[PDB]
Paper text:
We have utilized class A enzyme [name] from [name] as a model system, because it is the most widely distributed extended-spectrum β-lactamase (ESBL) globally. The clinical usefulness of β-lactam-based antibiotics has been significantly shortened by the emergence of specific bacterial enzymes referred to as β-lactamases (BL), able to hydrolyze and functionally inactivate β-lactam antibiotics. In this study we show the crystal structures of the β-lactamase [name] with covalently bound Bortezomib and Ixazomib at high resolutions of 1.3 and 1.1 Å, respectively.
As reference we determined the substrate-free enzyme at atomic resolution (1.0 Å) to identify possible changes upon inhibitor binding. No induced-fit mechanism upon inhibitor binding takes place and all active site residues remain in the position as in the substrate-free enzyme. In our crystal structure of the native enzyme at a resolution of 1.0 Å, using phosphate-free crystallization conditions, this site is occupied by a sulphate ion.
Numbering used by the authors: 25 to 57, 59 to 238, 240 to 288
């Protein structure tokens, strides 16, 4: 059975030619609205939130950890390194790496976070520690974005990621200073203007992390503070049938516009 919300999302999906996954949590009353909420989708760069959060968790017991400088070698650079390339043969602190990974989607920065955590499995272990039984990180950048249909590597579900993002930003999966820091990073994202944010009222404050990958995979996860009412968490995942499909951030904006109604 479907609601009119789900019907509108299904029509958007049909028009788009792809596969859309949505999870909304309204923290006013803890209700969820889901569309394909328990299907797996390739996370692509949305997985950077879990890696940054895992380092924040480490820093709760190692208070200067975020200011620890990490060497950037020429050999560390991958396919998209807008911030890390400014620091070759120099350093970036774990905070700088987190900001670059989250706010510019720097892929070298993500690999440094993964290395700090002992490999992709260290990111997954943190997910499990905070009650996310669904997330899995299997690979580093850039291969975590292959996004092959049916492949469970580097996937989660909309429901699981919405629940986790809520716990990380509005709940207490992290300590107070750390939750606030994650919120600061997400709010300052530079890559999200055409995704969820484009579908929401401009008066609403938004923190988000986008993702993109093969199969035209186009994703965004957000914490949203509407005017005059309790915050929301929204995940919008989208992927397409053919490997070289074009990005469709407009689909994410359209999904957010549907969800915001009412």
């Amino acid at each position: 059975e479907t609601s009119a919300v789900q019907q509108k999302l299904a029509a958007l999906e049909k028009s788009s030619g792809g596969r859309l996954g949505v999870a909304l949590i309204d923290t006013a009353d803890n209700t969820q609205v889901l569309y394909r909420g328990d299907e797996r989708f390739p996370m692509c760069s949305t997985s950077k939130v879990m890696a940054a959060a895992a380092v924040l968790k480490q820093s709760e017991t190692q208070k200067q950890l975020l200011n620890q400088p990490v060497e950037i070698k020429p050999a560390d650079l991958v396919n998209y390194n807008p911030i890390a390339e400014k620091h070759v043969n120099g350093t970036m602190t774990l905070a700088e790496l987190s900001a670059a990974a989250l706010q510019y989607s720097d892929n070298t920065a993500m690999n440094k976070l993964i290395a700090q955590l002992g490999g992709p499995g260290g990111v997954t272990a943190f997910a499990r520690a905070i009650g996310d039984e669904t997330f899995r990180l299997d690979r580093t950048e850039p291969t975590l974005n292959t996004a092959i249909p049916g492949d469970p590597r580097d996937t989660t579900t909309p429901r699981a990621m919405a629940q986790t993002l809520r716990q990380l930003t509005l709940g207490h999966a992290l300590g107070e200073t750390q939750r606030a820091q994650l919120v600061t990073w997400l709010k300052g994202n530079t890559t999200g203007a055409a995704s969820i944010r484009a579908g929401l009222p401009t008066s609403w404050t938004v923190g988000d992390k986008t993702g993109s990958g093969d199969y035209g995979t186009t994703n965004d996860i957000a914490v949203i503070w509407p005017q005059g009412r309790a915050p929301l968490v929204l995940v919008t995942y989208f992927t397409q049938p053919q490997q070289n499909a074009e990005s469709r951030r407009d689909v994410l904006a359209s999904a957010a516009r549907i969800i915001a109604e009412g």
